[PDB]
């Protein structure tokens, strides 16, 4: 289709269309399905905690006829707030009065196109925020991008956090020791009362940690000396055999000691301009490798699910005590046909019931 | 005499070997290479004791070093014992070693792609 | 796009996103041409290379 | 400490059988439950089996 | 936009080829901005004769394949590398596989 | 001393037969019985059989 | 001269294939008849076939 030439209004040139650049989105955790949906009809919720313990038994003389006794159990209660998100957008006639469509010659913009584009942008923003919140919850502390602290699991439940150092820099350092330490921690600190297999865990790491782990002499020589398809594939094949995040079709994967390592490159930008890497650990230089480990869903079964998401109701009329939904979208007409304005609402809080099972991994040594 | 398992790494073993050779000591184990070299470059080196030799009546027919700053042309394959003989012969001739390229090498015996970077002594 | 910030439920604040950008470009093209001709004198009494008569 | 020893590491690396691959680069947790964990670390060398 | 050049440094035995290949894949996957899932391993690689010769001789690449007892390893070292598609002159073209990337001369 | 010598160990380690694996990482107590133990140590090399 | 070269020898030395066993440890006389010799020397490498 023809348009005016570059330097003359009386000559025509041909237009071939448009090319669009769309920002990257990752949404890896959101697709694993770790977090269950638990809608509620209130702005807060409670939980009950029960504890008891046993100890060895001391021998007593038969004739004295004395004995021992066990102390009673302890019951406790807790509570949680929830996070509210909202944003606004509007459409006015000045956006469509004489504004050419980018990909055409003499076709005007219409209300429908702007509507669709803006709604898609809103949905993208909310998906990004959901992914960031899920990752923050997995880290163990739920904090808004602005930096506000909403939930502190390690204080809500009186327990500490564990960090595992791998010392990948040292050529002589052993990795099986750290892997076993992680396995024993996960197997012992659950206190679920049932048999637990610690071999079922996710281990998500960053680029530097993955490179250091893969290129360590001890791992490389051990996998090089073996004649088996796994050894061939990893040493001289392609390690990109994992699932798909929001950008790339396969995630770097590595197998060793029965543990599966995955490299996650997800990162987002705050509206202040700074960059929020998802896999980083607070107050640690980005040059050091870092990872996070958490149990699988099958490690305890659906009967004892550990990850949940709560959804609250909208503040507007007609939703006073409704069950709650992931996202609300509303539209209203401006005065005397002046335009249209939209609104999107959300109200949620992700949390964990056994935060002591979240372990951080580091490449340095101390 | 280099005692068995005296070094944890080939990188330090080569340094010890060069330091000993610069002291006038000579070594030759071409005839029983199989019983000295450990499995990999990350195991404990050497696998067994290595004894000095009285004489060094050895001279490669092919040119050594390949060039001024490289013992072998990149990618050359040679018998492992021959590499130690040739590096020793080069050092005897006034050359000095900067580093030994063994980072990504996989197999140690009977053939290896080892190489060295040379300079001039003072 | 960018992340969102937490807003308290009972104050009814909101957030907004910036618009997009557009730009245009142009391209010239290349032309090629060649010529040839055939004349009777090129065929008059010329023996075929691979044969005798 | 037992698994790090060169005489075991190199011998099993030189050996090429399903046991050798599993013990050096696989998972050693093959024993029965101990009442808390579903499996117990196990290592085989000579005729003896070690349990942690 | 600014063009990107990837240096392999095939004359340094300590050079890390895997790092360069990963850089290439990351560039392909990140700089598209197409807004869809993109596979970085579906790329053509056309190289010169000298580049092919240097790549084949590198100690890392040669040793990794020489240590493998698999049919692919034998063919790529002691066999013939002319397994590619027909050229305008040659009936086959040199092809080399490593790290999932196919090189054509 | 015999089972430890570098030459014997390397020669048996370079093999891939079931006998090679057994003698290097397995138990050598495959011999007959004496008055105190059920099996005596046994080693095969060069066609000769050694018993402790 | 060709057969002795370190690269040619090393390429086949580590390969587990009947061809590699024959060319390194076996006899290279597997060709046709020249009228004076029952068999003629031959060698395979890089897809080319060298004949003496």
Torsion, Cα of F3, F11, B87, G24 (10° steps): 170
Strand A201-205 with A259-263, pairing: parallel
Q: Chains G, D in contact: 3+ Cβ pairs under 8 A?
A: no
Q: How far is the C-alpha of A42 from the C-alpha of A108, rounded, in Å? A: 47
List the subunits that have 3+ CB pairs under 8 angstroms with D: A, B, F
Structure tokens at B17: 């070997």
Q: Chains G, B in contact: 3+ Cβ pairs under 8 A?
A: yes
Tokens 């996989």 sit on residue: B106
Contacts 24+ apart (CB under 8 A), E54-59: E54/E10, E54/E11, E55/E8, E55/E10, E55/E96, E55/E103, E56/E96, E57/B74, E57/B75, E57/E10, E58/B74, E58/B75, E58/E10, E58/E13, E58/E15, E58/E17, E59/B74, E59/B75, E59/B101, E59/B104, E59/B105, E59/B113, E59/B115, E59/E13
Strand A340-352 with A328-333, pairing: antiparallel
Q: How far is the C-alpha of B43 from the C-alpha of B21, rounded, in Å? A: 22
8 Å CB contact between G24 and G36: no
Cβ-Cβ contacts under 8 Å for E19 (sequence gap 6 or more): A211
Torsion, Cα of A25, A29, A30, A34 (10° steps): 180
Q: How far is the C-alpha of D8 from the C-alpha of B47, rounded, in Å? A: 14
- The closest alpha carbon to E84, from E54, E105, E62, belongs to E105
The β-bridge partners of A308 are A36, A351
**CB neighbours of residue E91 within 10 Å:** 9
Distance from CA of A242 to the nearest CA of D (A): 20
List the subunits that have 3+ CB pairs under 8 angstroms with A: B, C, D, E
**CB neighbours of residue A101 within 10 Å:** 13
Going through chain A in order, the beta strands assigned E by DSSP cover: 2-4, 12-14, 36-39, 45-51, 74-80, 83-91, 141-143, 149-152, 162-165, 201-205, 253-256, 259-263, 267-269, 275-277, 290-295, 307-311, 328-333, 340-352, 359-362
8 Å CB contact between A264 and A292: no
How does A21-37 read in b/e, with b if 16+ C-beta sit within 10 Å? eeebbbebbbeeebbee
- The closest alpha carbon to F51, from F38, F37, F40, belongs to F40
Residues of chain B with a CB closer than 8 angstroms to some CB in chain G: 76-79, 107, 110-111
8 Å CB contact between C15 and C4: yes
Candidates A6, A128, A148; nearest CB to C6: A148
Q: Chains B, C in contact: 3+ Cβ pairs under 8 A?
A: no
Distance from CA of B84 to the nearest CA of A (A): 22
CB pairs under 8 A between B and G: 12
Q: How far is the C-alpha of E61 from the C-alpha of E54, rounded, in Å? A: 11
8 Å CB contact between A141 and A133: no
Tokens 């991008």 sit on residue: A145
> D21 vs A228: CB contact, 8 Å cut-off?
yes
Structure tokens at B63: 């040119």
- In degrees and rounded to multiples of 5, residue F13 shows phi and psi of -75, -30
Q: Please give the radius of gyration of chain A, using alpha carbons only, rounded to the nearest integer.
A: 28
Q: How far is the C-alpha of F36 from the C-alpha of F33, rounded, in Å? A: 8
Cβ-Cβ contacts under 8 Å for B56 (sequence gap 6 or more): B26, B28, B88, B89, B92
Q: What is the resolution of this structure in A?
A: 3.4
8 Å CB contact between C3 and A276: yes
The three-point CA angle D18-E63-B115 to 5° equals: 135
Q: Which of A25, A28, A230, A236 to mutate to test the interface with E (most CBs of E within 10 A)?
A: A236
**CB neighbours of residue A127 within 10 Å:** 17
Strand G42-45 with G48-51, pairing: antiparallel
Tokens 């923003």 sit on residue: A125
Instruction: Name every chain E residue with its beta carbon within 8 A of the beta carbon of G45.
Output: 78
- The closest alpha carbon to B105, from E58, A123, A34, A18, belongs to E58
Instruction: Name every chain B residue with its beta carbon within 8 A of the beta carbon of D6.
Output: 5, 38, 43-44
Candidates A198, A226, A257; nearest CB to D21: A226
Q: Which of G10, G12, G15 to mutate to test the interface with E (most CBs of E within 10 A)?
A: G15
Cβ-Cβ contacts under 8 Å for F9 (sequence gap 6 or more): F3, F24
Q: What is the DSSP letter of D37?
A: B
Q: How far is the C-alpha of D5 from the C-alpha of C42, rounded, in Å? A: 91
The β-bridge partners of A141 are A152
Please return the burial class of E93, using the count of CB atoms within 10 Å of its CB with bins 0-12, 13-18 and 19+.
Answer: middle
**CB neighbours of residue E99 within 10 Å:** 19
Ramachandran category for residue F47: left, alpha or beta (phi over 0 → left; psi -120 to 50 → alpha): left
**CB neighbours of residue D48 within 10 Å:** 8
> E39 vs A248: CB contact, 8 Å cut-off?
yes
The three-point CA angle A299-A300-A302 to 5° equals: 120
- The closest alpha carbon to A136, from A363, A361, A349, belongs to A349
End-to-end CA gap in chain C: 82
Residues of chain A with a CB closer than 8 angstroms to some CB in chain B: 171-172, 217-218, 221, 224-225
Question: What method did the depositors use to determine the structure?
Answer: cryo-EM
Helix (H) or strand (E) holding C24: none
Instruction: Name every chain A residue with its beta carbon within 8 A of the beta carbon of B42.
Output: 171, 217-218, 221
> A196 vs D38: CB contact, 8 Å cut-off?
yes
End-to-end CA gap in chain D: 12
- The closest alpha carbon to A93, from A352, A261, A353, A333, belongs to A333
Instruction: Give just the sign of the alpha carbon dihedral A315, A320, A326, A327.
Output: negative
- The closest alpha carbon to F31, from F42, F44, F18, belongs to F42
> E40 vs A235: CB contact, 8 Å cut-off?
no
Helix (H, G, I), strand (E, B) or coil at A28: coil
Q: Please give the radius of gyration of chain E, using alpha carbons only, rounded to the nearest integer.
A: 15
Candidates A21, A238, A249; nearest CB to E100: A238
Distance from CA of F39 to the nearest CA of B (A): 31
Candidates E34, E39, E70; nearest CB to A232: E70
* Cα A58 → chain centroid: 49
Structure tokens at B50: 């290595």
Q: For chain D, give me the number of helices (H) and strands (E)?
A: 2, 2
- In degrees and rounded to multiples of 5, residue B116 shows phi and psi of -140, 155
Q: How far is the C-alpha of A216 from the C-alpha of A207, rounded, in Å? A: 14
Query: Distances in Å between the alpha carbon of G7 and those of B74, B75, G14?
Result: 13, 10, 12
The β-bridge partners of A142 are A151
Query: Distances in Å between the alpha carbon of B76 and those of B6, B68, E15, E52, G47?
Result: 29, 16, 16, 16, 22
Q: How far is the C-alpha of A202 from the C-alpha of A291, rounded, in Å? A: 10
Structure tokens at G38: 């029952």
The nearest alpha carbon in chain D to A196 belongs to D37
- The closest alpha carbon to A53, from A71, A37, A68, belongs to A71
Structure tokens at A191: 């206190």
Candidates A171, A172, A221; nearest CB to B40: A221
The β-bridge partners of A61 are none
Distance from CA of B11 to the nearest CA of A (A): 11
Structure tokens at B32: 């029983």
The β-bridge partners of B78 are B112
Instruction: Name every chain A residue with its beta carbon within 8 A of the beta carbon of E19.
Output: 211
> F25 vs D16: CB contact, 8 Å cut-off?
no
Full DSSP string of B58-119: ---SS-SSSBTTBSS-TT--EEHHHHHHHHHHHHHTTEEEEEEE-SS----SSEE--EEEEE
The nearest alpha carbon in chain E to B77 belongs to E59
8 Å CB contact between A255 and A230: yes
Cβ-Cβ contacts under 8 Å for C46 (sequence gap 6 or more): none
The β-bridge partners of F48 are F45
Helix (H, G, I), strand (E, B) or coil at D51: strand
The β-bridge partners of B23 are none
- The closest alpha carbon to F51, from F24, D46, F39, belongs to F39
Instruction: Name every chain G residue with its beta carbon within 8 A of the beta carbon of B78.
Output: 6
Query: Distances in Å between the alpha carbon of C16 and those of A50, A115, A120, B102, C4?
Result: 46, 15, 14, 57, 9
Q: How far is the C-alpha of A82 from the C-alpha of A87, rounded, in Å? A: 17
Q: How far is the C-alpha of E101 from the C-alpha of F7, rounded, in Å? A: 42
Mind spelling out the 3-state secondary structure of chain F? CHHHCHHHHHHHHCCCCHHHHHHHHCCCCCCCCCCCCCCCCEEEECCEEEEC
8 Å CB contact between B107 and E66: yes
Distance from CA of G14 to the nearest CA of B (A): 9
Q: How far is the C-alpha of A15 from the C-alpha of C31, rounded, in Å? A: 20
Instruction: Give just the sign of the alpha carbon dihedral E20, E23, E27, E28.
Output: positive
Mind spelling out the 3-state secondary structure of G5-46? CHHHHHHHHCCCCHHHHHHHHCCCECCCCCCCCCCCEEEEEC
Q: How far is the C-alpha of A264 from the C-alpha of A252, rounded, in Å? A: 8
Helix (H, G, I), strand (E, B) or coil at A225: coil
Q: Chains D, C in contact: 3+ Cβ pairs under 8 A?
A: no
């Amino acid at each position: 289709m023809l348009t005016n030439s570059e330097k003359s209004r009386f000559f025509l040139a041909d237009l071939t269309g448009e090319v669009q650049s769309i920002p990257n989105t990752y949404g890896y955790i959101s697709n694993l399905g770790l977090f269950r949906s638990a809608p509620i009809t209130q702005t807060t919720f409670l939980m009950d905690l029960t504890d008891w313990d046993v100890s060895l038994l001391d021998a007593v003389d038969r004739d004295s006829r004395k004995a021992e006794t066990s102390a009673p159990e302890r019951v406790r209660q807790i509570s949680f707030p929830m996070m509210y998100f909202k944003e606004v957008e509007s459409i006015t006639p000045d956006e469509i009065q004489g504004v050419r469509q980018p990909g055409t010659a003499n076709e005007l913009t219409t209300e429908a196109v702007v509507r669709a584009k803006k709604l898609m942008k809103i949905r993208t923003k909310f998906d990004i925020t959901r992914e960031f919140l899920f990752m923050q919850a997995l880290k163990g502390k739920v904090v808004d991008a602005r930096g506000t602290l909403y939930a502190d699991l390690y204080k809500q439940f009186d327990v500490e956090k564990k960090t595992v150092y791998f010392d990948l820099d040292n050529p002589n350092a052993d990795i099986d020791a750290s892997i076993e330490e992680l396995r024993m921690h996960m197997e012992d600190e659950a206190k679920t009362g049932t048999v637990i297999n610690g071999e079922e865990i996710h281990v998500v790491v960053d680029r530097v940690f993955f490179s250091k782990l893969v290129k360590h002499p001890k791992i490389r020589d051990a996998y090089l000396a073996q004649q088996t398809p796994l050894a061939w594939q990893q040493i001289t094949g392609s390690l990109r055999t994992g699932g798909t995040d929001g950008v790339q079709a396969h995630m770097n994967t590595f197998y060793y000691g029965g543990v599966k390592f995955v490299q996650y490159n997800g990162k987002f930008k705050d509206k202040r301009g700074k960059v929020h890497t998802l896999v980083s650990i607070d107050s640690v230089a980005a040059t050091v490798g870092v990872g996070h480990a958490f149990p699988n869903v099958s490690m305890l079964g659906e009967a004892n699910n550990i990850f949940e998401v709560a959804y609250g109701p909208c503040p507007k009329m007609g939703y006073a005590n409704t069950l709650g939904q992931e996202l609300y979208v509303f539209e209203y007409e401006k005065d005397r046909d002046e335009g249209i304005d939209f609104e999107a609402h959300s109200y949620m809080l992700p949390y964990c019931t056994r935060p002591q099972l979240l372990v951080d991994v580091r490449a340095d040594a101390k | 005499m280099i005692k068995a398992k005296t070094y944890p790494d080939f990188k330090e073993f080569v340094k010890g070997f060069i330091a000993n050779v610069k002291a006038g000591k000579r070594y030759d184990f071409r005839t029983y290479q199989e019983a000295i070299l450990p499995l990999t470059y990350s195991s404990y080196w050497p696998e067994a004791d290595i004894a000095e030799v009285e004489k060094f009546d050895y001279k490669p027919d092919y040119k050594v070093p390949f060039s001024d700053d490289l013992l072998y042309s990149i990618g050359a394959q040679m018998r492992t014992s021959d590499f130690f003989m040739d590096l020793q012969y080069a050092i005897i001739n006034g050359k000095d070693v900067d580093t030994v390229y063994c980072e990504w090498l996989a197999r140690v015996k009977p053939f290896s792609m080892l190489n060295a970077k040379l300079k001039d002594a003072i």
